């Protein structure tokens, strides 16, 4: 499912993580990187590679902090995966939720449909694989931590989502 | 299911096709367009147009000839869709089969992983929807017509698929 | 040749099968159905209706698997016929054989002599048309797949035939 | 898990098969051998020799067809095992399944409780080994192939199971 871009396909550094998730998982956290945005597979690969580099080389972590990244090229970029605990929402949230992030600042712009599809397509692919539980619940980043993520424009959009719950 | 690019989004001429396919469909025929390859959501939307254009405007079909198209961008472009009859492998095979075409000439080139993932993941969405038989059979275009389609390289890769019977 | 009962006469569902045998075929493979038997054309047409139904409804196949079916009514029923490959004895033998089945279970019964005649003649006819080699070889279902088919009593018998090869 | 009579111990011929399954496997096809049955370690180790002999001497195969076998003595016998592709349910299911095979004929006859535990256990093992999926599906041989296997009484039983799915 999900037509996800493998970690090795974006030249991603070998994860060093261990902590697993209590799947089937209940919560989902939509963030934004707030970095540079990309719209081509070649440019979007370089960007998740770049997000990782900052989380691993500089911030110290075992792997890129999100479970999955969504590019404006329409493709879902693999981070920690369906099983390995996140690093996106704080210690209350990281072990009970798959975090996903859109590549770009979405304060004063919206993400293309092809990403928002790819986002939903993924979440379905979650249930399908069994990592998400059938009636998964979706939160914005600002719901669960003091933060301007996931961007003013993207925030409203995910509020009107089938599986959303405030 | 699926991250399929809908017709609106690639700017497609409205279909005048009404003839249907009896669900569930048994077969799937893999072709190439033997044309210019694209590899960005934008450039691949234009390629979808160019193909359909040649099909409606020159050959005089009700729509683009294929049911779906696969881009080297890693996206599925919607054509005649799941329920409508195609025009991609002559008249014995057209009424009993879904035709998918990779956008390119694959005689000396391979489609990248993401093309092949999107196609395969589509077929699974087909199965899941009940539009394909769960025991569907993938055929080469050159198996069911005397063509070079879907190109020597791509032909080899579809042969390795779970569901390939010649 | 042929006093074979055609498909339309026993009220067959239409074959979705399309792959073709090379003529002249070299091998014939004798199976039984291991089901109930029949001795009227009104039951032996119902029987082949039910045998096809098993294969197309439950197994989800394209058509009844056998190329023809021999009834104890004394008549041959047209399955896939001479030209379409059967799904009767696995994928080595299927494309180099005609597979005929006796509607009944011949573990604890011989097929009545009219049913034997029916089968023997079918082959005779076959050779005349060019659909079998003049020196075709007969196997039993157990000789090429692990099965009790065509039944002990019927296996005894077919071992006596001119064209048999152990 | 454990407690499986190895090939060496029932005195199998050297396997020549090379084609491997992909783990974890989804489907399990219960069959029967259809012949006479055993209820002692030495009678059953003989039984499996009789069987393999047939499949390797008479049918010219690389090895015994079934991935495993289940004597009424209470013990599992190694076949092709978890990692090698079977030859027990046609070119369709053989590459996506584990073929277990009760030794006997179970048309009017149940296997004894200890043969049913031997099998139920072998599967949990396979799950715990990551050889099978945790949501594996248990098909009858008759559910996927034209046959009476695994016998009208054993089939009745397998239908009751947690992981049965026609």
Swiss-Prot record, chains A, B, C, D:
In Gene Ontology terms, what is one molecular function of this protein? zinc ion binding
- Record localization: Secreted; Cytoplasmic granule
One cellular component term from this protein's GO annotations in UniProt: extracellular region
SUPFAM superfamilies referenced in this protein's UniProt entry, alphabetically: N-acetylmuramoyl-L-alanine amidase-like
Which Pfam families does the protein's record reference?
Amidase_2
Which InterPro entries does the protein's record reference? Amidase/PGRP_sf (IPR036505), Amidase_domain (IPR002502), Peptidoglycan_recognition (IPR017331), PGRP (IPR015510), PGRP_domain_met/bac (IPR006619)
Q: Which keywords does this chain's UniProt record carry?
A: Antibiotic, Antimicrobial, Disulfide bond, Immunity, Innate immunity, Secreted, Signal
Q: Does the keyword Disulfide bond apply?
A: yes
A GO biological process of this protein is:
negative regulation of cytokine production
> What PANTHER family would the database entry show?
PEPTIDOGLYCAN RECOGNITION PROTEIN, PEPTIDOGLYCAN RECOGNITION PROTEIN 1
Q: How does it assemble?
A: Homotetramer.
Instruction: Tell me the protein family, please.
Output: Belongs to the N-acetylmuramoyl-L-alanine amidase 2 family.
Please give the name of this protein.
Answer: Peptidoglycan recognition protein 1
Species of the source: Camelus dromedarius (Dromedary)
């Amino acid at each position: 499912c999900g037509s996800i871009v493998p970690r090795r396909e974006w030249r991603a550094l070998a994860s060093e993580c261990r902590e697993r998730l209590t799947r089937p998982v209940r919560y989902v956290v939509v963030s934004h990187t707030a970095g540079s945005h990309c719209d081509t597979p070649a440019s979007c690969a370089q960007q998740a590679q770049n997000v990782q580099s900052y989380h691993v080389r500089n911030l110290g972590w075992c792997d890129v902090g999100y479970n999955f990244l969504i590019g404006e090229d329409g493709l879902v970029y693999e981070g920690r995966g369906w099983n390995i605990k996140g690093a996106h929402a704080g210690p209350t949230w990281n072990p009970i939720s798959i975090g996903i992030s859109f590549m770009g600042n979405y304060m004063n712009r919206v993400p293309p449909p092809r990403a928002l599809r790819a986002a939903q397509n993924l979440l379905a692919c979650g249930v399908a694989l069994g990592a998400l539980r059938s009636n998964y619940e979706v939160k914005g980043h600002r719901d669960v931590q003091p933060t301007l993520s996931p961007g003013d424009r993207l925030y409203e959009i995910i509020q009107t989502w089938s599986h959303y719950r405030a």
